[PDB]
Amino acid sequence: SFEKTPAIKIVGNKFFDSESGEQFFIKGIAYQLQTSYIDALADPKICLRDIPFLKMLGVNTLRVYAIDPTKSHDICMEALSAEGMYVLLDLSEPDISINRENPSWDVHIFERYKSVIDAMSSFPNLLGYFAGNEVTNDHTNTFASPFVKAAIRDAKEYISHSNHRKIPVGYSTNDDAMTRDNLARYFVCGDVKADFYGINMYEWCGYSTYGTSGYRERTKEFEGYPIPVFFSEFGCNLVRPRPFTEVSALYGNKMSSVWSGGLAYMYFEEENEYGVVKINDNDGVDILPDFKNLKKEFAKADPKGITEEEYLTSVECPHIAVGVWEANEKLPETPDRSKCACLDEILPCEIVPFGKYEEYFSYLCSKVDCSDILANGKTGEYGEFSDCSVEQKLSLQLSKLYCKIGANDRHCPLNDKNVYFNLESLQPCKNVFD
């Protein structure tokens, strides 16, 4: 039973408890142990150790960056519900993410997102999904953001055309001044919109103020923004112990009318000095001085919200400007698993997954036309097979060189142990093919 955590819903630019009608404010902390990620919410001994410490801290929300969808989460998710706690969840993992330097929206990443959605959507205390975290981070990689918008669209589509509660799908961004307005506008522009928007906000350092930190200016620029907005991370570590005086500002009357709260970064201490606890060699919890300051600030924080009943009584995309903003409004298409699966059956020359990609793409794309696998977020040109996996794309180009050479001897023209002749290509899915 999840009675202590009714589903939160979005109306306009605010969160609301769907059963009480009261506005929901996030008082959170990031909770991530550093598969090749660790999924503490799949390990009862870890989460049941930490939840009593989370309870003392006074949080109602965790941010989790990676779960293993092949594992069960009901024990930890029920234990969290018992203490009134919700989860914001990233859909990616470290090795399956939109790469900001070479962005793609493809079958491999989309399948990861779906699996996470399938693993976690039955939990009423799943607050929301992040389709991206700081993908575009400065003016040289804004062309990554159309790939993220496509991911939001396709994630929302897949949630929509399914049996699940319509869990909102949003985005988490950094705080680079040259890109931040454009990013905010881009994610609510056109036909595809994020459902909510978190900022990783570290502008308030030590004993700062509302007027000197930048918080006032941020608050004024997000006032009237059409979707819920909050601090997906906060807790600058200039001075230590961290005072967390930003918490008083965040949940004060001025900021609580714009921001839906925030999540401190983070629970575990991990060589970066951001923890509120340290895990000892016994695997027990040692409370750090930060914990008490955060605890005391969250306890004082009493945001003045509005009831849903009371609250009840598309925008232009940024222009393209070279060097500054280069995110095309035209998005890549929904990746097609069945179409890309056909390459595995028909292609003469295949390569098993691996530095070598960049090397082997440079090589093959000098000998054959690679337009069919390129994805360009600046111009909105996406090749026919640009949604396929990193290996299928490479296999296609190698197979193209093989046929162009014409030898027809089953010698694939690239010397590498991962290259092999595909015997399935001699057999008679879809003749739609190339």
Swiss-Prot record:
> Where found, per UniProt?
Cell membrane
Q: Which family does it belong to?
A: Belongs to the glycosyl hydrolase 72 family.
Q: What is this protein called?
A: 1,3-beta-glucanosyltransferase GAS2
Residues in the active site?
A: E134 (proton donor), E233 (nucleophile)
Gene behind this chain?
A: GAS2
Q: What is the effect of changing E233Q?
A: Abolishes catalytic activity
Location of this fragment in the whole protein? 29 to 494 of 555
What job does this protein perform? Splits internally a 1,3-beta-glucan molecule and transfers the newly generated reducing end (the donor) to the non-reducing end of another 1,3-beta-glucan molecule (the acceptor) forming a 1,3-beta linkage, resulting in the elongation of 1,3-beta-glucan chains in the cell wall. Involved in spore wall assembly.
The GO cellular component terms are: cytoplasm; fungal-type cell wall; fungal-type vacuole; plasma membrane; side of membrane
Which GO molecular function, any one, fits this protein according to its record? 1,3-beta-glucanosyltransferase activity
**Consequence the record notes for mutating E134Q:** Abolishes catalytic activity
Keywords carried by this UniProt record:
Cell membrane, Cell wall biogenesis/degradation, Disulfide bond, Glycoprotein, GPI-anchor, Lipoprotein, Membrane, Signal, Transferase
Q: Does the keyword Cell membrane apply?
A: yes
Q: List the disulfide bonds.
A: C47-C76, C189-C317, C205-C236, C340-C388, C342-C429, C349-C412, C365-C370
Question: Which EC numbers does the record give?
Answer: 2.4.1.-
Q: Does the keyword Phosphoprotein apply?
A: no
